[PDB]
C-alpha cells in the first residue's frame, strides 16, 4: 500500500540515508511494493540464512549431515560468539551451528559453516547457480560488516534478496524437509524483537533474520502472514545513516506497522 512508501520516504528523511524496501507475494513472487529495489546494501547477518540454505542443499545431496559434529578451538572464536563460546569444550553439530547462526547471529557459528561449504566464494557460487547474480559474500565474520560506502563486497539488492529468499523457502531448490528446517530456524529467531515482530498481531506467523553493521547499516528479511501462515516476503535495508540503533530500529518498525496495517 502506498501509505507504506510514505513511511519509507519518511524513514530516509529521518535517518538521512537510503532505505531499500521490498514486499513480495509469497505465492506468485510478484512485487507488491518496492523502493530502491536495485540499490546495493550490506547484507550483515541476514546472509546467515543464505549460508544455511547452501548448507541444507548439501545435506539434501547427502554431502553433509545435520548431526556431523565440528570440533573447533580458541583460534576460531571471533567477536560475538555467545553459543559457540559456551560449547567450546563440547563442540557443536552442523544443525546446532545453523540454529546458532540464524537464531542468535553467532559469528563464529557462521564462519564454521562457511568453512564446511568452502568459504565466501562458494556461497556466492551457490547463489549464482540458483539464479542470483547480484548477491555476493566476500569476507568472513566480522569483517563482512564493514559497510564501506560504495563497496560492493558482501552486499545484495532488496529485489535479489527477496527473490532468493522466496526460492530457498518455496522453490524446489531444497527438499520440503530442508525448506521446513530453514523456515523453522528463522521462525525461532530470537534477536530481532525490536523490528517487524514488534508490530506483529497475535496469531500471525513470522520467520525472519535481522542484521546490523557499521555506518548505521541495518536490515531484516522476512516471511510473514496472518493466521499462522506466511503469504509475503519482506526485505528492508538501510545504510549510511548516523542515527542511533534505537532510531533505526524505530523507523524499521514503523515501516512494519504500516505494512501490517494495510495488509
Amino acid at each position: 500500500h502506498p501509505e507504506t512508501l510514505v513511511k519509507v520516504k519518511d524513514a530516509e528523511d529521518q535517518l538521512g540515508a537510503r532505505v531499500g524496501y521490498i514486499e513480495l507475494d509469497l505465492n506468485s513472487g510478484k512485487i507488491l511494493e518496492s523502493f530502491r529495489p536495485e540499490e546495493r546494501f550490506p547484507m550483515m547477518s541476514t546472509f546467515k540464512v543464505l549460508l544455511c540454505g547452501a548448507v541444507l542443499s548439501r545435506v539434501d545431496a547427502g554431502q553433509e549431515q545435520l548431526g556431523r559434529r565440528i570440533h573447533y578451538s580458541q583460534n576460531d572464536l571471533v567477536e560475538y560468539s555467545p553459543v559457540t563460546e559456551k560449547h567450546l569444550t563440547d563442540g557443536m553439530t552442523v544443525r546446532e551451528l545453523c540454529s546458532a547462526a540464524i537464531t542468535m547471529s553467532d559469528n563464529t557459528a557462521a564462519n564454521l559453516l562457511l568453512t564446511t561449504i568452502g568459504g565466501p566464494k562458494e556461497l556466492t557460487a551457490f547463489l549464482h547457480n540458483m539464479g542470483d547474480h547480484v548477491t555476493r559474500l566476500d569476507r568472513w565474520e566480522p569483517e563482512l560488516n564493514e559497510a564501506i560506502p560504495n563497496d560492493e563486497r558482501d552486499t545484495t539488492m532488496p529485489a535479489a534478496m527477496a527473490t532468493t529468499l522466496r526460492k530457498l523457502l518455496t522453490g524446489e531448490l531444497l527438499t520440503l524437509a530442508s525448506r521446513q528446517q530453514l523456515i523453522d530456524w528463522m521462525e525461532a529467531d530470537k534477536v530481532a524483537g525490536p523490528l517487524l515482530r514488534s508490530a506483529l498481531p497475535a496469531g500471525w506467523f513470522i520467520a525472519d533474520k535481522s542484521g546490523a553493521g557499521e555506518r548505521g547499516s541495518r536490515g531484516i528479511i522476512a516471511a510473514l502472514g496472518p493466521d499462522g501462515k506466511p503469504s509475503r516476503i519482506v526485505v528492508i535495508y538501510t545504510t549510511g545513516s548516523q542515527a542511533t540503533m534505537d532510531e533505526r530500529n524505530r523507523q524499521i518498525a514503523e515501516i512494519g506497522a504500516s505494512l501490517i496495517k494495510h495488509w
Binding site: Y80, E96, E143, G211, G213
Partner: protein, 165 residues
C-alpha cells in the same frame, strides 16, 4: 533492577551457586537451558543484533553446583587500551600472562573466558583475553582493532587479531 553489568560480572566469584549468581546478576536478565545447556547466560544493554553478556558455567547441573567458568562480551571496558599491530606481533607463544601484558599494554585487555577444568583445583586453567587498541573497544557496536590471546596455566598458547594498525 538493572541489566547485567561489568560490576556484577566481577562481583561474581568462582565457586558460587546458581542462586548466588542469579541474586547478583538479577534473575530477569538471565536464562538457562536451550543453546546454553545448564550454564546461566545473562544479558546487559543492547549491542547490535544482541546484547552485551556474561555466561556462567557450572561443575554440574545440580542446584549445589559451583561456578567453574566465567565468560563475558561487552560488559568490561579496557582501562587503558594501547594495543597496536606492532605490539601484537611482538607477542609470542610461551609468554606468561605478565610478559604478554608487558607487551600489549597493562590496560589493554579484559577477560573474555576463564575456565577451571579441574575446579576447585586451579590446575589446567584456561584463560582468554580480549585486548583492544586506542578505540578498538565498544560495548554496543563492532570492535575496531582487537585481539584474542589465550593461555593455559598462565602460559600463552595462541593469538589472533582483527583490524589492528
Amino acid at each position: 533492577a538493572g541489566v547485567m553489568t561489568g560490576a556484577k560480572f566481577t562481583q561474581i566469584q568462582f565457586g558460587m551457586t546458581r542462586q548466588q549468581v542469579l541474586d547478583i546478576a538479577g534473575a530477569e536478565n538471565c536464562e538457562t537451558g536451550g543453546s546454553f545447556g545448564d550454564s546461566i547466560h545473562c544479558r546487559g544493554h543492547a549491542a547490535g543484533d544482541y546484547y552485551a553478556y556474561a555466561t556462567f558455567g557450572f561443575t554440574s547441573a545440580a542446584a549445589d553446583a559451583k561456578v567453574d567458568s566465567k565468560s563475558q562480551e561487552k560488559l568490561l571496558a579496557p582501562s587503558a587500551p594501547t594495543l597496536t599491530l606492532a605490539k601484537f606481533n611482538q607477542v609470542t607463544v610461551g609468554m606468561t600472562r605478565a610478559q604478554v601484558l608487558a607487551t600489549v599494554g597493562q590496560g589493554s585487555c579484559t577477560t573474555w573466558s576463564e575456565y577451571y577444568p579441574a575446579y576447585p583445583s586451579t590446575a589446567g586453567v584456561t584463560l582468554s583475553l580480549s585486548c583492544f587498541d586506542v578505540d578498538g573497544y565498544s560495548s554496543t557496536g563492532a570492535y575496531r582493532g582487537s585481539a584474542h590471546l589465550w593461555f593455559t596455566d598462565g602460559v600463552l598458547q595462541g593469538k589472533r587479531q582483527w583490524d589492528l594498525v
